[PDB]
Design a protein around this ligand. Structure first.
Ligand SMILES: CC(C)(C)CNC(=O)C[C@H]1CNC(=O)c2cc(-c3ccsc3)cn21
Length: 273
């Protein structure tokens, strides 16, 4: 059923998230990724509309599926005796944002603007579908290099979006907000905005702004690269220590730095091709 439907290619990556392989859908040759997660390693469980016990990522990915290409699409999934297997759409050629930044250094602001805008659109889509990602970071963003389109991946640390406090977290610590560090408590949207400020800093500076818990808590941002005043302002706003001082998604997208974004295709033409 699974092994016959897909041609497994090379391992793309493995880590806390499981193991992800390149694959091809045999039926039509569609490029896919094949993600294996061991059952014992599964953090949160959910249940399907028809009531079947699945990894939360499966629940979350089904919730965000539509014609919108900003979130990686779940094509199918399978249960094995000791693991789940997720079939994801795979852009080709593709490069994660982490590698892209590594090789190119800090991104030109025009490019960071286009990329950050697309991430914001993807995250808003998740939130609008009642899904909180909880691990927004450069390693969880794929770049469709031909189309200039970014895709959010890995909902393995995600949760249903709620308006009450979260007291669990298993995303990436250096992207996690000061309230999580200090109090083990955060709200979904304002924690997301914090991680987005970390991400935006990462794009325009070539590295994350904080490494140690103490730096996260202090929230003092130092710019190691030349970054425009308007970009700096937005970053510092996203990284407000008090969650209620952070911009809403609407406020981020209305920020002067965010105006006149390139289209994804223009972005690929100017910056990727
Ligand atoms: C950039 C790559 C060469 C693809 C390597 N990255 C990963 O394997 C990260 C891994 C993290 N967790 C995931 O859920 C995940 C999905 C994918 C993916 C999805 C479509 S192509 C690759 C890749 N991942």
């Amino acid at each position: 059923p699974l092994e016959s439907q897909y041609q497994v290619g090379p391992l793309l990556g493995s880590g806390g998230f499981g193991s992800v392989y390149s694959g091809i859908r045999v039926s039509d040759n569609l490029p896919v990724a094949i993600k294996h997660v061991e059952k014992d390693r599964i953090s949160d469980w959910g249940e399907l509309p028809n009531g079947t016990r699945v990894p939360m990522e499966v629940v979350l990915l089904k919730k965000v599926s539509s014609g919108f290409s900003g979130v990686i699409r779940l094509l199918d999934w399978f249960e094995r005796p000791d693991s789940f297997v997720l079939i994801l759409e795979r852009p080709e050629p593709v490069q994660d944002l982490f590698d892209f930044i590594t090789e190119r250094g800090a991104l030109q602001e025009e490019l960071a603007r286009s990329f950050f805008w697309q991430v914001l659109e993807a995250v808003r889509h998740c939130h609008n579908c009642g899904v909180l990602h909880r691990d927004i970071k450069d390693e969880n963003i794929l770049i469709d290099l031909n189309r200039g389109e970014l895709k959010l991946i890995d909902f393995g640390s995600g949760a249903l979006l709620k308006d009450t406090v979260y007291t669990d977290f298993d995303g990436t610590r250096v992207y996690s907000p000061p309230e999580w560090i200090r109090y083990h408590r955060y709200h979904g949207r304002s924690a997301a905005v914090w991680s987005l400020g970390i991400l935006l800093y990462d794009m325009v500076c070539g590295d994350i702004p904080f490494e140690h818990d103490e730096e996260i808590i202090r929230g003092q941002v130092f710019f190691r690269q030349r970054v425009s005043s308007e970009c700096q302002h937005l970053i510092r706003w996203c990284l407000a220590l008090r969650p209620s001082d952070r911009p809403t998604f609407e406020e981020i997208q209305n920020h002067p730095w965010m105006q006149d974004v390139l289209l994804p295709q223009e972005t690929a033409e100017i910056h990727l091709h």
